[PDB]
Design a protein around this ligand. Sequence first.
Ligand SMILES: [K+]
Ligand code: NA
Lengths: 116, 118
Amino acid sequence: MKMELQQFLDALASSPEKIEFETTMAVIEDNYDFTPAAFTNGNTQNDANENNGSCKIFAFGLLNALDKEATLACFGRFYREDVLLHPENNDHQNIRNFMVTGWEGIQFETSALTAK
Amino acid sequence: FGMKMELQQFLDALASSPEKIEFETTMAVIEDNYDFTPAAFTNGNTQNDANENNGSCKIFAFGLLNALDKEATLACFGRFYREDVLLHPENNDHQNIRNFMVTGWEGIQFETSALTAK
Ligand SMILES: [K+]
Ligand code: NA
């Protein structure tokens, strides 16, 4: 995963419950050039350089035509544990907002990633 | 003059009656509502270099931005899909379309963002 895209993508397709935020970060960093971008995500607005981890997953899920579920898997434990196990909390508003509004709620002001 | 295609009406119209969607209509919506940036992308068994099959490039990116369904993204090709491709499965006309129908979003991968909302 960490350096090669397709294996990550296959793992994500095979065993989403098993990917970890740091493995998404690794893949994205090893395969894309990142440029900070503002983006909105349903209710939330991220300025450039803000919630970069989220910025990376959304932009990577856009390049990769990831469905809503696989995109949430990319957030690893912050999704599977912090957020999914706790509906009454307001922890990690990019995850919580994407769960509601999904890909329709995402909107980049500018392109965040380009393949190396 | 002063006539911009409204995105949401397109998408609702696309929702209720896909078969009435025309390709020029898609081209119009997208050109009025987004900045286009030539991007290479693969689509199952086709690869498009930057600026290659731009029509296709724009529709797929537009189906990504609007969280469109496979079938709905296909409706955007208008008659190229509805007539050229769907009436003639034996043929090899329009590989991006024929390709997407098989591999769907799973087969799509962009090198870089093709579209960005105005
Ligand atoms: K894909
Ligand atoms: Na959107």
